[PDB]
Design a protein around this ligand. Structure first.
Ligand SMILES: O=C(/C=N/O)NCCN1CCCCCC1
Ligand SMILES: O=C(/C=N/O)NCCN1CCCCCC1
Lengths: 540, 540
């Protein structure tokens, strides 16, 4: 028995497992309970710390996935099932994982903490694409990842009430960060050098931890990949959250007709239902037909977020803060086969103009007809207003800029102009083993496998260039975790990555070619979303 | 005694004059009266045909310029003096000029008819830049140019009244075209092949003759240079025309204190005033501070224009029509020193961001604050929003696209898609002798000297390539006048000028280099002015 696979934390003793990489072994501790199981009367309630245990808890395999919707549109398809749960579903899912270098670092090592995405309705830390054995081996970093409640179990909010306050999924993440502060030293990690990084909804969660004072003291750096807390999908108002929670109760027979009314009777009725029943009606509470819109998301209630994310970003003071942000080349292409007319992943999706005009109302839901015409004006090539290929790329840009690129650019500009050191990138490499159609280019979420060094897996069919490219990316992320600067501290041969400023707006392109400096994260398109359209919506 | 300088027309006999060109002599008949002098009780009235005369009218020099405002901002400056009157001012100004080749053509020759511009408030056919001796000698065509009343004397309108019906300046042009149909054969001209061409307000006049049935049968081809009848400056409503006419009457003491102010007594009071007194208050009736806006323009009253030029262009049948339209490279740069803050012709006019935002309200007058925001959104380089050089060219584009380029492109597209054969150009050569500052580029109106072959003047310091360039353009304009096709019908080696279509939107660039085919007359910018902005103004 290896002595390094046995670690004592504040709650008790753990037994880890040993993972193999082509470059050496890594010690992993998968399935550490950091909270009491939020079951029965604890559903919709904030998490409670895990009570100390007797004996040796087995931490050799991933624990259960939180209850969530499962994508079944394309059975057996790799592009969709890689995000589906790989463990059985259960409300007893609040567990975290710790990948530590081996031999265990004798000196405090910076810590990376991963928060998965999934529109706040799905995701799991046990996915193969989030395997941190290659990143920990190649860069000798301590990597931590947790599970948090998604869907109604994590973000159903009846504002004002104590039985369903909302944002408990964000509190699950906060408790996992407190666990890192109190226990990551036992694994060789430095609790004074904690870097959060997440993608999509995980990136939005990272941004909300920066804007929440109680969470701000639990970390020191932030990485937001293809997401931001100020996105049109990341938050919801108190009134809309109450309507969505009330309809979900109605769809499952709550309250029993006709007795019931207040939130105490409504949540009590919701707690008597099998968790699967609540999942089966989640997508039936959205207000309209749309893409990139989710039912139960963080609510702006004044507690976890004293104001809207946009308000907190503008009024924020971010001195002494290092942030790394970026997007992929084709942020919106993936979402078009989930609602936009004329689109299919199994053909070329060469839509007509009538389908393009209809798709704008799906990609930009709940806006006036005049606002839709302003969108069509900006995203139409009026020399080729009928070309199906250009219209396909246009609608992809409409969804990507509205939901990802411009919310991130707005955040990156305000952060750098208010004391924060910011670095920006654009991921432009399409994996050679990508199963999605070619017209989608570099879809949303397909830089993650290169950040985690998945091409180093010998059982996979990546090329030799993608292996070297993956190692260069892991260097960038690890250097930012250690020094707050993605550049090599001393290497002068490698081209440099300049910070992102509100004026120069410099970023770099990440692909097989060396670094290339560019200016402006779609300055022309994002000026429409961030500056003009809000004024157009004010004057209805 | 040259017998070719004596010609008899329907009204009487004339004596012409021989003009010298480096390639040969030309016969000219300058100062032919085509209408009774609109003086005294004839002020503001439609023109009457010139009564027949006894003897030989002398036609050896230009007649008087119609009463008009004189630009005196820069005394002695060639850039402004070249457009000022070069003969004495008088209301007795309705005279036309005929240049005919020598020896006089024994065969019917196609006729070019020039209509000068000047915002309908100025201009004259006697200007040196409109000299037709070079175009007539080089291409052996017949050129005719007329004078028409400008300002209040030609376009003061009290709609519904009979003393000042309006558009009488347009009727002066129509009468001159009826004169060409009845007398151009005496000069060797073909009345069955008449091609109109004009610039700025003259181009807008040619467009209004296309949309007026009584004028349409007097010509067969049209050329519109840097102007169109659907421009925001070329027409005015009945209510606004009445307000401007009433305000001008008030400024000159009409009606007297205690006198009724009906249309009969108001115009009667205006007729007793000296012509210069009316000119001295012309610029004091415009609604607000602006550029490219003129006080007395053609009125839409249902007579000369049965509907707005936009309505007539859309619902028009143009089969059997060849049009040649085009613009210069920097249409709006010249108007900026006439009202835009921070601009001066004697410095670099490196305006600030605040001066750019203020100039937008001067260049686009009477639009909502939201409409101005959309203009700033489209014409701001959000990667360099404060660069003074880019702001200068941006405001130049705002004035040029809003007043010239986009009104012309909209007309060229509707004509081609409704039966007319259309050719489009963009003039991109800046004259070597241009006195305006360099930052203005190719200003409004500075292709005329090349169309009329002015570089061939030995007394002027043009370069040898501009001389050959002027001969190319005179060949283009003559070929279009003869055959309706500017391309050489005998040389397939030379680059071809493809017709302008609503789909391909092809045009050619006119400079010292050979023809270059391009697509789209600022399609992105003109989609804002022609499509989105009207929808914004309706929703206010
Ligand atoms: O977020 C959505 C939107 N579906 O319409 N689907 C889940 C797919 N994503 C794709 C990559 C982001 C990480 C979670 C998995
Ligand atoms: O048309 C204007 C507008 N002034 O603000 N000014 C007269 C100058 N133009 C020069 C170019 C068009 C030919 C007529 C005379």
């Amino acid at each position: 028995e290896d002595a390094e696979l046995l670690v004592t934390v504040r709650g008790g003793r753990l037994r880890g497992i040993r993972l193999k990489t082509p470059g050496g072994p890594v010690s992993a501790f998968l399935g550490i309970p950091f909270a009491e199981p939020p079951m029965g009367p604890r559903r919709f309630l904030p998490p409670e710390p895990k009570q100390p245990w007797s004996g040796v808890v087995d931490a050799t395999t991933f624990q259960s996935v939180c209850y969530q919707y499962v994508d079944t549109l394309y059975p057996g398809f790799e592009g969709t099932e890689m995000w589906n749960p790989n463990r059985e579903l259960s409300e007893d899912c609040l567990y975290l994982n710790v990948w530590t270098p081996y031999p265990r670092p004798t000196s405090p090592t910076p810590v990376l903490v991963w928060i998965y995405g999934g529109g706040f309705y799905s995701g799991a830390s046990s996915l193969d694409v989030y395997d941190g054995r290659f990143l920990v081996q190649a860069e000798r970093t301590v990597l931590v990842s947790m599970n948090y409640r998604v869907g109604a179990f994590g973000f159903l909010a009846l504002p004002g009430s104590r039985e369903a306050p909302g944002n408990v999924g964000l509190l699950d993440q906060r408790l996992a960060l407190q666990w890192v502060q109190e226990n990551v030293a036992a694994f060789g990690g430095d609790p004074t050098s904690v870097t959060l990084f997440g993608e999509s909804a995980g990136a939005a969660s990272v941004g909300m931890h920066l804007l929440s004072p109680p969470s701000r003291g639990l970390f020191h750096r932030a990485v937001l990949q293809s997401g931001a807390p100020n996105g049109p999908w990341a938050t919801v108002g108190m009134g809309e959250a109450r309507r969505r929670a009330t309809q979900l109760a109605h769809l499952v027979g709550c309250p029993p007709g006709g007795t019931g009314g207040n939130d105490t009777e409504l949540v009590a009725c919701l707690r008597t239902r099998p968790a699967q029943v609540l999942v089966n009606h989640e997508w039936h509470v959205l207000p309209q037909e749309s893409v990139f819109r989710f039912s139960f998301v963080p609510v702006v209630d004044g507690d976890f977020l004293s104001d809207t994310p946009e308000a907190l970003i503008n009024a924020g003071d971010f001195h002494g803060l290092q942030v790394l942000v970026g997007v992929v080349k084709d942020e919106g292409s993936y979402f078009l086969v989930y609602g936009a007319p004329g689109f299919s992943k199994d053909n070329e999706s060469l839509i007509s103009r009538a389908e393009f005009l209809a798709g704008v109302r799906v990609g930009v839901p709940q806006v006036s007809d005049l606002a839709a015409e302003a969108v069509v004006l900006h995203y139409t090539d009026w020399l080729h207003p009928e070309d199906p290929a250009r219209l396909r790329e246009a609608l992809s840009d409409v969804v990507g800029d509205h939901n990802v690129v411009c919310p991130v650019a707005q955040l990156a500009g305000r952060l750098a102009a208010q004391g924060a050191r910011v670095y920006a990138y654009v991921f432009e490499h399409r994996a050679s083993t990508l199963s999605w159609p070619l017209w989608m280019g570099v879809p949303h979420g397909y830089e993650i496998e290169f950040i985690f060094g998945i091409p180093l897996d010998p059982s996979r069919n990546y090329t030799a260039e993608e292996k070297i490219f993956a190692q260069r990316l892991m260097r960038y992320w690890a250097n930012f975790a250690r020094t707050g600067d993605p550049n090599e501290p001393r290497d002068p041969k490698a081209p440099q990555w300049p910070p992102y400023t509100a004026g120069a707006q410099q970023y770099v392109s990440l692909d097989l070619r060396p670094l290339e400096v560019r200016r402006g994260l779609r300055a022309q398109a994002c000026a429409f979303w961030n500056r003009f359209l809000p004024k157009l919506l004010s004057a209805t």
